[PDB]
Design a protein around this ligand. Structure first.
Ligand code: EMC
Ligand code: CA
Ligand code: HG
Ligand code: HG
Ligand code: HG
Ligand code: HG
Ligand code: HG
Ligand code: HG
Ligand code: HG
Length: 487
């Protein structure tokens, strides 16, 4: 074993894993089939993902990692083109064969601003953190074969000698050789970057019409409709930022619409179908090619990170959340394993538990969200389930960050994160919310099998929220006429 850990994928997940382990005294090899700079999706930061980056930073004493959580610090330390601003999520609802209304809009603002991550700069910066702490990085390499045994891992590489390690981590997308070589809602997505995409305010309805507390231009804008959704994620939405691009992607429920032609053709069809969405793109041009994307965890000496186990639908940006929490749970255990020379699956079981629940939680959340797209009033009532969970979890992560900062006790932090009752779930540690979430699923799931009217199901969810309101944070989730829930 020449290295302690081999890492597959040199994107942000693979880079942060590399940095924390290198910092802690492990000899790390990062392996990637591509090279920096390069494009990557997964751009919308969230309150949770912001806290998790600060937890990793504080837990492993790497200040640079925390810069990636604050948009002002990304501008200052990564670069002026590295991000746009996010003051919240927003969801604007549409319908085929009907004019779109500026009243069919929900947008919960954040207390503190988050980033829209321009991943080519953010990821390269993250790799540079890893490189500065002693991680070794090899780019443009082809992994032929991977051999696992009692004493370690051996990875064979095209036109190079094999490389040995005590442990191997898959931090790449699904379908890497480690996934290949070891033994609910159908979707496909299209995405790209564009120049001259108009703002929601200039293109659709100004701020005086929507009465939104935030500009949707300064938000992660999700346009929703019965068969799927389209995202508009600007990088050009803040004075300090020099980036000219908007990230644009759209995704279909293949049970309701199966795309059949090339990406640019499918984009135009969708704009014809929803002319309100089309008002963004009158003078817009593609800045790169459209990507089409159609469609266990651990062992003694390997570990798949969440993104390698399966597709995490980005409707609520839980990819990054689950990715970063996984690294935070796994890293201390990999250190203990390397320091004590014990490499047994049983050591990494809670990383698997978090992962399974996280992706199931996201699957359920997204599956039942695709039904809610059927009608705005139903969507409006449904999103409060997500939001109340997401708010509870964020508060827990903040509480963990605060205790970690005041005490400085790393061992105490790892135990407290391990001891949460519902790891991977939206709330992390609230039994009453998780009850609400499972009952809300059962109302949505039996609403579409046995086809119920959208009014009665919207009412049933509304009654569930009222029943559980006292256990949620005092934000007035039950007030349905209020479409912009303040913190
Ligand atoms: C699978 C919902 Hg914690
Ligand atoms: Ca070593
Ligand atoms: Hg920014
Ligand atoms: Hg498809
Ligand atoms: Hg733009
Ligand atoms: Hg894992
Ligand atoms: Hg998983
Ligand atoms: Hg659900
Ligand atoms: Hg369920």
């Amino acid at each position: 074993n020449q290295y302690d850990v081999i890492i597959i994928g040199s994107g942000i997940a693979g880079a942060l894993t590399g940095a924390v382990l290198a910092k802690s005294g492990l000899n790390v090899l990062i392996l990637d089939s591509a090279q920096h700079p390069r494009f990557s999706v997964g751009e919308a930061a969230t309150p949770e993902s912001g806290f998790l980056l600060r937890l990793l930073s504080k837990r492993f004493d790497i200040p640079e990692i925390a810069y990636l959580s604050h948009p002002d610090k990304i501008i200052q330390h990564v670069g002026s083109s590295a991000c746009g601003i996010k003051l919240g999520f927003s969801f604007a609802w549409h319908q085929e064969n009907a004019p779109s209304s500026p009243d069919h809009l929900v947008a919960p603002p954040l207390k503190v601003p988050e980033a829209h991550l321009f991943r080519q700069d953010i990821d390269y910066f993250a790799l540079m953190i890893a490189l500065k702490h002693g991680a070794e990085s090899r780019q443009n390499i082809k992994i032929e074969s991977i051999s696992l045994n009692d004493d370690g891992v051996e990875v064979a590489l095209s036109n190079a000698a094999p490389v040995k390690a005590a442990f191997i981590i898959d931090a790449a997308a699904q379908g890497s050789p480690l996934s290949r070589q070891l033994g609910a809602t159908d979707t496909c997505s299209f995405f790209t970057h564009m120049l001259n995409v108009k703002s929601y305010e200039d293109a659709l309805a100004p701020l005086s019409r929507t009465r939104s507390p935030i500009e949707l231009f300064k938000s992660t804008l999700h346009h929703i409709f019965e068969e799927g959704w389209l995202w508009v994620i600007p990088f050009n939405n803040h004075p300090q930022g020099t980036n000219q691009l908007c990230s644009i992607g759209f995704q279909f429920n293949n049970a309701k619409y199966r795309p059949t032609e090339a990406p640019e053709i499918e984009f135009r069809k969708l704009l014809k179908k929803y002319p309100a969405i089309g008002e963004h793109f009158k003078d817009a041009v593609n800045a790169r090619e459209w990507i089409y994307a159609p469609r266990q965890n651990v062992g003694d000496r390997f570990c798949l990170l969440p993104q390698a186990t399966g597709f995490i639908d980005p409707l609520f940006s839980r990819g990054l959340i689950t990715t970063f929490e996984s690294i935070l749970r796994l890293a201390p255990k990999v250190l203990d394993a390397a320091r004590s020379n014990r490499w047994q699956r049983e050591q990494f079981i809670e990383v698997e538990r978090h992962c399974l629940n996280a992706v199931a939680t996201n699957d359920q959340l997204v599956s039942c969200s695709y039904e809610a797209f059927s009608d705005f009033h139903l969507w409006n009532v449904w999103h409060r389930v997500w939001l109340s969970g997401s708010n509870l979890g964020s508060a827990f992560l903040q509480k963990l960050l605060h205790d970690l900062e005041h005490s400085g006790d790393a061992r105490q932090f790892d135990a407290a994160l391990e001891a949460v009752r519902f790891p991977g779930c939206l709330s992390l540690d609230s039994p009453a919310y998780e009850s609400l979430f499972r009952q809300s699923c059962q109302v949505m799931q039996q609403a579409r099998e046995q086809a119920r009217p959208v009014a009665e199901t919207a009412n049933a969810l509304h009654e569930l929220i009222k029943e559980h309101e006292a256990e949620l944070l005092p934000l007035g989730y039950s007030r349905i006429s209020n479409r912009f829930i303040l913190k």
